[PDB]
Amino acid sequence: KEVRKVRIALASPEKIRSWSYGEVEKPETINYRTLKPERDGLFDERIFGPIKDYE
Amino acid sequence: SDPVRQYLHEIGQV
Amino acid sequence: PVSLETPIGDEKDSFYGDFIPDEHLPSPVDAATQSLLSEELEKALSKLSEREAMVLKLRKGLIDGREHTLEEVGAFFGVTRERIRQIENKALRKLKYHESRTRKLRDFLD
Amino acid sequence: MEIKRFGRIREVIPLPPLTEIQVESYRRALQADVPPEKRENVGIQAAFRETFPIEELVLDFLEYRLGEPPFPQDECREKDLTYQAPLYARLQLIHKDTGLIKEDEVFLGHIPLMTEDGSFIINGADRVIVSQIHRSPGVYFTPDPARPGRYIASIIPLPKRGPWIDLEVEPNGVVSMKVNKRKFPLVLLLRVLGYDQETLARELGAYGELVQGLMDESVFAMRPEEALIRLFTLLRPGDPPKRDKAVAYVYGLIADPRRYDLGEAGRYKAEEKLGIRLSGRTLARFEDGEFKDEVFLPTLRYLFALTAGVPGHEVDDIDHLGNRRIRTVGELMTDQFRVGLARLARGVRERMLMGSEDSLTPAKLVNSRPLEAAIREFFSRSQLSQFKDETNPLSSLRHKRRISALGPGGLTRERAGFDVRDVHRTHYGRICPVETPEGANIGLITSLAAYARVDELGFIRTPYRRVVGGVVTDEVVYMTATEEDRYTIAQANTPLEGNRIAAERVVARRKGEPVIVSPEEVEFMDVSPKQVFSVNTNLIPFLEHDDANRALMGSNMQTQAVPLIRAQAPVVMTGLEERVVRDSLAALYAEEDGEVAKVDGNRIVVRYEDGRLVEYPLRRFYRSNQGTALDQRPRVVVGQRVRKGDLLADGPASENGFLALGQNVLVAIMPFDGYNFEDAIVISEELLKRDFYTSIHIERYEIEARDTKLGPERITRDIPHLSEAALRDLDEEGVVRIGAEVKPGDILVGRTSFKGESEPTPEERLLRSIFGEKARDVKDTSLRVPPGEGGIVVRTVRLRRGDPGVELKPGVREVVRVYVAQKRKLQVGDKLANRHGNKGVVAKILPVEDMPHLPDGTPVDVILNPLGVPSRMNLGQILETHLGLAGYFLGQRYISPIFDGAKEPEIKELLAQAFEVYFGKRKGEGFGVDKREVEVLRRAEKLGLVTPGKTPEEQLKELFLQGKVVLYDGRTGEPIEGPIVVGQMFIMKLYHMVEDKMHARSTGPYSLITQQPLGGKAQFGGQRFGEMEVWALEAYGAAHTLQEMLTLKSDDIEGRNAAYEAIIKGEDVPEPSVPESFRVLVKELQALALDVQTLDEKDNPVDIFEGLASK
Amino acid sequence: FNPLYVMAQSGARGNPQQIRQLCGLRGLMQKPSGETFEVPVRSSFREGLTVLEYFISSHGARKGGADTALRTADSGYLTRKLVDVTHEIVVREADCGTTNYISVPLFQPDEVTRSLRLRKRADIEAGLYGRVLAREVEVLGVRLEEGRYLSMDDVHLLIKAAEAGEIQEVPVRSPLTCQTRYGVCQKCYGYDLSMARPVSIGEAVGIVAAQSIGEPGTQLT
Amino acid sequence: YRAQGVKLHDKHIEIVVRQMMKYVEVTDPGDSRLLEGQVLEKWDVEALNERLIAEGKTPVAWKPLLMGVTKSALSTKSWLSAASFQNTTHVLTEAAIAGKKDELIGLKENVILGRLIPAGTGSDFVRFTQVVDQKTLKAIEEARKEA
Amino acid sequence: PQEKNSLKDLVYQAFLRLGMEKTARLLDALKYYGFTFSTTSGITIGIDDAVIPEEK
Amino acid sequence: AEPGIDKLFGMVDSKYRLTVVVAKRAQQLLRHGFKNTVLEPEERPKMQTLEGLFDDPNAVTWAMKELLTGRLVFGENLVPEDRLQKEMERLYPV
Amino acid sequence: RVDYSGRSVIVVGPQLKLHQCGLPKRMALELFKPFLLKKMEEKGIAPNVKAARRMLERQRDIKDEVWDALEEVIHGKVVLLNRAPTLHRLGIQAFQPVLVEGQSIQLHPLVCEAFNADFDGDQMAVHVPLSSFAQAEARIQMLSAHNLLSPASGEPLAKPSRDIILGLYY
DNA sequence: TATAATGGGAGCTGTCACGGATGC
DNA sequence: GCATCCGTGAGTCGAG
Ligand SMILES: [Mg+2]
Ligand SMILES: [Zn+2]
């Protein structure tokens, strides 16, 4: 299909929760030793997806 | 407008 | 860590992050190169028999993404694991020969 | 050759040390050469005295000392070190209870040292701290814009040293004080100061109607304590009004010398304006338990006296240079020092509570980190701390003399209207009216005048000669603008016989206003015209003949001149070109009288009168900040007798001690085949042949090998999959050999990096299987020569880990630096300029046979279009050309001073003497007038240039006195149909060179978030196609081109990939897709809790994330 | 045949005031306040100025530079506003069909004579050239038909007719009166001025308007 | 412009002025849903009033309104256009509340979307134009005749 | 004598009568001969070319 | 100036339509390898190499010249898109 | 910011036809690089595209046949020249490039007025329209020779000036 | 993991004009 | 209705 229009509207907490792939429960970013993302933190792969393709 | 001042004022009421 | 928004210059016009390349996403050139490699590989594999091209494709993961064992490819073609090892080896032999002749796949060796 | 200097003006004093504004300022700030007991309370000393004693245990300051630098300057530049001295302070800890005294000298870190030339070396790079102009502290009275018959009194302290206070008379009649955006009645504060109705009535009563407006019964009723608590409740609402808190706060706002500092200049200006004496730098005092007024009553009194129209009371011009002052290096640095010191003091006070209250040394109490950080912050990250401009010696000399109204504690660019950017009448002799940047910074960045010096208070002073009776003394008085306004000052060119004024009427100034005056009325006289202009402006001959707008460009552009291998001083100088070189410190001179023992490319050894043998090493092929080569060449020979101050070696861009920013070329002013079009310039290939305008440039390349979690980066000659052709010029260790020629693509330093873990694609599995070759563990990370660069490798520096004397930043095993040099010949697109603001790019280099030429066969060097002259109104270049012709034939150079110069008659005379040589030679050689010279003479008398009936020789001489000659077109052999202006002009090659600016990109690096190409040549960036460019494409109605710019050529990932593949396959480029930056916009709006939905015609959602972002 | 004179006269370079500064006197200079000095600069650039004269000139030079610097931002901003306001306007069709129009006056009421006088040539050309005629117009025995785009010649003819008292104003199609939604139409627009011929449907006319008004901005004193 | 010797056609200034006069203010709502003092485009109130008067309903009484280029630009129906202009937060909060839909009519909207603009070669007028050679044309014609 | 205005008029009239391609050709020609003659013309500037009138 | 640009602007109601016709035609030429051309062997656009005259690789030049001949037919709704593409692939395979 | 773009210093090119500009070869080699790779494959200059690119990477590996190839590539094509500030639509124009030795872009005198370009060190940006469509738009709508009159006043934009006027008047 | 300890600290000053809400 | 306060704007490309 071809885009003919762009709508903008307020988002219910429901819709925001429907966007979300997970809750970020922790202020952590990445592990100080491994440099890998910390689980439940802002960079978590379980939430936002894998760092490397199909792995 | 200053959260610190506000908090100090609330603290001072006890 | 340091801010990507760290200012460069005394004007507000530029940021540090603006000078940092993306090393993750493939460049147009790299994508192109990989595509050409797949196409030259298929061209070279067409100079084999369907069966001996299929054995190689099945063994090296070009099909299905997994590398099949000799016992699996052999069981798939109804032949013996030794038979399939043999047709794989003669297939690879023809590939190497056509390669020495046409010099096509050399430049993709980096 | 002979040097003939014009002008009758005798300057009683020489130019001041030119970098003294930097040097003396910093010297005064550090007081390093003064023994501690003899130090004045100023600079660093004053900062310590202000910060200490730290009360709470009591910590007191005794004295400080500065050590010697750990490393010399050259070493610092080499190793990325700051050139600096260790600072120590002797502190004594005292317990006032016990009487106990522990005393120690604590190390406070290092402070950067100024070099001999007034600059700094900060982390290996040379920097200048630019002086900052601002409003002088003091007490000012300005007209209130709203109410005409009323005024505002403004009390201004030093920046960061207090709030400003404004005293106003409100429409209701009561006098209000404004502090920290809050207003209150001034009467209340007066009551806190202990004033009573009686005192105010007797004091201010003389000005009738205002004092009753000052009267408030309730305030006078309550004693100063109640008034202090009341005032505190006004200033700090919601804060419980404990009396001690009120005392502390008001003291800190007004009487505290730590939190409130009027300048010393602030104090002086206040005392002078209000006619009082300050006991200190604060608006009031805390003495014997109460508050005592200092400032407020005199300022209020002056305000009322002004409103009432009392004689002797004036409003202040805030752009007057009496009210505007300079903060030099010392003051700025000292400010940051004071800040770091206050922080260190906070730390001390906090340490005086915790820990053991008994056992403490001064060493335990003091953490110097805040101080070190404040200073390191000032020198590294300040706006006033700038990368030094050292393109040529004059560049840095000028840089150090610049004055900025920008920077911290000063104007922003919107904050700057016309008033500030204006040339004030008081700029005369102080700030140059000419040299300022063209564009947005105009009037904000300015330059110190040549004879100007900044006094101890920070006001710019200019010299004048005393005139008593009609006699001009040789005694000079440096005056501020305020003191200058008192006298009647005659112009420097006013006629003199001996020391007596020889004119019946003289041209003078009274408060900047030009006036005709009798010799009896002349109090002072200008030292020189040079004093009106900056150093750059003073280097422009015939400046009086140049329109200011162009002279500006001349000034600024001398800054951009590149040092040339064959560089020469101009044939017409102003007489400053020697001094500039000397003050620059680039050239080398002899200390005392003596004899030269040794002369080398690398060094000069001199045996002086003392008998002592001094060796001067010479800086050879060193790379400046801008990559121009700084190198010294010996000007003396072995056994030569030299005197004190005699030239030993020439620095860069100097010839025998004279400033050489360019070359002297033979120029013709005439159009040539449109190659001259619109300021473009035509030059002769002869210039390249003889290596005129050739310059040396050095670029520095650097690479680090560091520890990785994947294993070590290694600098090695062993690089995977590389031919011996590729490795040829690399040594055993992998570094390119000295003397090798490197071109784009060539390896400078070989390096391997351990491959990031990856699963080889099935394609790579099959390939690897076909060739039977293991994929290597390491990847080729080598440093290569970038596009458009390259040259000869002149140097390599290698620094490893675990070798003596060197330690790198954490994780870094080794660092390699490669210095690559290039000899740059003048080429098409390179930029030339003269000192008059004539500038142009070289569009054509013709072979010598096409060049216009004189009858005797001499071809011209440069051809300049006359169309550049008339609109620009810079005629100085013309006079320069004429005098240059005369000098070309007489074999001589001239000094024509600014505003007292060679005038037309004298130039005509020189031209005649020149013609004799240009022609009489020919007549003696047995040649008569040419046929074509006759034709040209015919057309010339048709033009009214020559008088009809005179001999051809007489007419040719008539033309030559007009600076015009017969010129032959090298293509035809036929003459140009009219006589043409030809002569020697001084022209410089500027720092803007096509080699540096030429850039192109097919595909390349992209940005992280936006996925759009990076910027700049250095990142291999794409050009910015901006809003206005898009507008252009829209107005053309070119939709597909525009769409390409927005998609295939930028952030459409699928699109650009597909486009590349299609183009290399010969297919037409594919239909574009969604730009990644739109997806970025959508997600960013989702982060703002806004739902942005792309819809089809049926109002159904369209997914531009292609299922990837939805569960 | 003097070079300055020739350059000035031909329009190759130079203008009278610049030549006046070269061979003449430099003239009156203004203080930073804008107020003019009583003493003018009697010198010319050929003669050379005096340091006092030169310094006096610098005030005005600087004021000019600051003027320019602060002006380019204002012009730029204006241009961006205009672009944002006109960007959607495109020629979307041939005729919106409107019967409406505007009458371009050939005469301006003169205030000093308190009577009508002829507008200047270029003004009329700016209001007329390349416009479609709203109604038929007969002047000097020529029939200018309804729907005719005015050639520069047509305009000159109307001016000559106006001088002959035949016609005091011209009915003309204009974007003001155009009924086209989201833009204008070919007829109400007229000539695409760059081609001296009817505008093509699809030309983005608003952008061109904003660029046309905006470009000279830095030259307005 | 004339004083500066700048020749500029009245036409362009008229395009702009036309956008300045784009809007109207309601004096009386009539039988419509509109409110007194409410501002809207002249086009929309003309369409509405011809929809009411043809329905036998009292039409809206309105007044001409002149707003400067900034205000006019900020008031445009397109929120991508308005939000890319200036005052982004205001434009976007009102747009987001209203559930506004951008129809992608003008240039800026499409440029932001990386789309093919509705002007020049992108105009719907010239966009769909086909080219065919006479040989292939006649071949296709015979093919269409034989069905 | 041909100057800015007459030449501009010439260009415009040529655009009207002869079209784009020919006017482009005319422009290139005018450029060529203009430059060519400008160089041999003997136009220059000396200081005496700025002539102070006796009337001053 | 492009040769016969005035006549080309003559052929159309809107210049942008000229651009569309030229562009699409050039796409046709590239796609079918120029063998669908309406030009005659002596009308073929030429390019000077070191070897000598060869066919001009530039399809837009070709398309403009072709247009000038008159042998091309342009407009809206001349033929369904699929049918056109297929008839062209039948007449000039790839 | 965009791909297939470049920038350099401008120099007058009197010898140019109105529809032409001087374009430095090294710039052209980069701007057209993919096309050049394809052409280098068509002619025998490289076995394939990868080898061709590897060959263009080192400047000393560049032989003279690739320059002829590049001449073949750019044939009939135009580029866009732009100069900031772009005040009106003539701030961008299309020109057929003439490859030149040297690092400067050569600009035709007649277009200087529209760009407000001059030779005191001004620089210009170059862009390559990629598609048949973009190239068509450029050659037809944006070409310098096709826009001779101001869209603002309707008067001639590209017209004699400076030296040209001077000579003709003389 | 326990002596007692009980309300912060840094302010930032040379625009300038408009639209729009809000205030006697 | 008219003061007044707050919030929002103030050219482009290059380099750094
Ligand atoms: Mg310029
Ligand atoms: Zn209409």
JSON list of N, CA and C in Angstrom, two decimals, chain D residues 928-942:
[
{"chain": "D", "resi": 928, "resn": "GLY", "atom": "N", "xyz": [66.60, 53.01, -32.46]},
{"chain": "D", "resi": 928, "resn": "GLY", "atom": "CA", "xyz": [65.70, 54.15, -32.39]},
{"chain": "D", "resi": 928, "resn": "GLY", "atom": "C", "xyz": [64.31, 53.68, -32.03]},
{"chain": "D", "resi": 929, "resn": "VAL", "atom": "N", "xyz": [63.35, 54.60, -32.07]},
{"chain": "D", "resi": 929, "resn": "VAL", "atom": "CA", "xyz": [61.97, 54.26, -31.74]},
{"chain": "D", "resi": 929, "resn": "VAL", "atom": "C", "xyz": [61.41, 53.22, -32.70]},
{"chain": "D", "resi": 930, "resn": "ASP", "atom": "N", "xyz": [60.59, 52.34, -32.16]},
{"chain": "D", "resi": 930, "resn": "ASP", "atom": "CA", "xyz": [59.98, 51.27, -32.94]},
{"chain": "D", "resi": 930, "resn": "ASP", "atom": "C", "xyz": [58.81, 51.85, -33.72]},
{"chain": "D", "resi": 931, "resn": "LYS", "atom": "N", "xyz": [58.47, 51.20, -34.83]},
{"chain": "D", "resi": 931, "resn": "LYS", "atom": "CA", "xyz": [57.29, 51.57, -35.60]},
{"chain": "D", "resi": 931, "resn": "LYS", "atom": "C", "xyz": [56.02, 51.53, -34.75]},
{"chain": "D", "resi": 932, "resn": "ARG", "atom": "N", "xyz": [55.86, 50.43, -34.01]},
{"chain": "D", "resi": 932, "resn": "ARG", "atom": "CA", "xyz": [54.69, 50.22, -33.18]},
{"chain": "D", "resi": 932, "resn": "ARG", "atom": "C", "xyz": [54.63, 51.20, -32.00]},
{"chain": "D", "resi": 933, "resn": "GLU", "atom": "N", "xyz": [55.79, 51.56, -31.45]},
{"chain": "D", "resi": 933, "resn": "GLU", "atom": "CA", "xyz": [55.84, 52.59, -30.42]},
{"chain": "D", "resi": 933, "resn": "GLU", "atom": "C", "xyz": [55.29, 53.90, -30.96]},
{"chain": "D", "resi": 934, "resn": "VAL", "atom": "N", "xyz": [55.53, 54.14, -32.24]},
{"chain": "D", "resi": 934, "resn": "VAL", "atom": "CA", "xyz": [54.99, 55.32, -32.90]},
{"chain": "D", "resi": 934, "resn": "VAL", "atom": "C", "xyz": [53.47, 55.21, -33.03]},
{"chain": "D", "resi": 935, "resn": "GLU", "atom": "N", "xyz": [52.98, 54.04, -33.42]},
{"chain": "D", "resi": 935, "resn": "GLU", "atom": "CA", "xyz": [51.53, 53.87, -33.53]},
{"chain": "D", "resi": 935, "resn": "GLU", "atom": "C", "xyz": [50.84, 54.11, -32.18]},
{"chain": "D", "resi": 936, "resn": "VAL", "atom": "N", "xyz": [51.41, 53.51, -31.14]},
{"chain": "D", "resi": 936, "resn": "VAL", "atom": "CA", "xyz": [50.88, 53.67, -29.79]},
{"chain": "D", "resi": 936, "resn": "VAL", "atom": "C", "xyz": [50.93, 55.13, -29.37]},
{"chain": "D", "resi": 937, "resn": "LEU", "atom": "N", "xyz": [52.02, 55.81, -29.71]},
{"chain": "D", "resi": 937, "resn": "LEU", "atom": "CA", "xyz": [52.13, 57.24, -29.41]},
{"chain": "D", "resi": 937, "resn": "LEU", "atom": "C", "xyz": [51.03, 58.05, -30.10]},
{"chain": "D", "resi": 938, "resn": "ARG", "atom": "N", "xyz": [50.71, 57.68, -31.33]},
{"chain": "D", "resi": 938, "resn": "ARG", "atom": "CA", "xyz": [49.62, 58.31, -32.07]},
{"chain": "D", "resi": 938, "resn": "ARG", "atom": "C", "xyz": [48.31, 58.18, -31.29]},
{"chain": "D", "resi": 939, "resn": "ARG", "atom": "N", "xyz": [47.92, 56.93, -31.01]},
{"chain": "D", "resi": 939, "resn": "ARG", "atom": "CA", "xyz": [46.70, 56.70, -30.23]},
{"chain": "D", "resi": 939, "resn": "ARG", "atom": "C", "xyz": [46.72, 57.38, -28.86]},
{"chain": "D", "resi": 940, "resn": "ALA", "atom": "N", "xyz": [47.92, 57.52, -28.29]},
{"chain": "D", "resi": 940, "resn": "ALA", "atom": "CA", "xyz": [48.09, 58.14, -26.98]},
{"chain": "D", "resi": 940, "resn": "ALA", "atom": "C", "xyz": [47.86, 59.64, -27.01]},
{"chain": "D", "resi": 941, "resn": "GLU", "atom": "N", "xyz": [48.33, 60.32, -28.05]},
{"chain": "D", "resi": 941, "resn": "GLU", "atom": "CA", "xyz": [48.04, 61.74, -28.15]},
{"chain": "D", "resi": 941, "resn": "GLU", "atom": "C", "xyz": [46.58, 61.94, -28.51]},
{"chain": "D", "resi": 942, "resn": "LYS", "atom": "N", "xyz": [45.97, 60.94, -29.15]},
{"chain": "D", "resi": 942, "resn": "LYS", "atom": "CA", "xyz": [44.52, 60.97, -29.32]},
{"chain": "D", "resi": 942, "resn": "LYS", "atom": "C", "xyz": [43.79, 60.87, -27.97]}
]
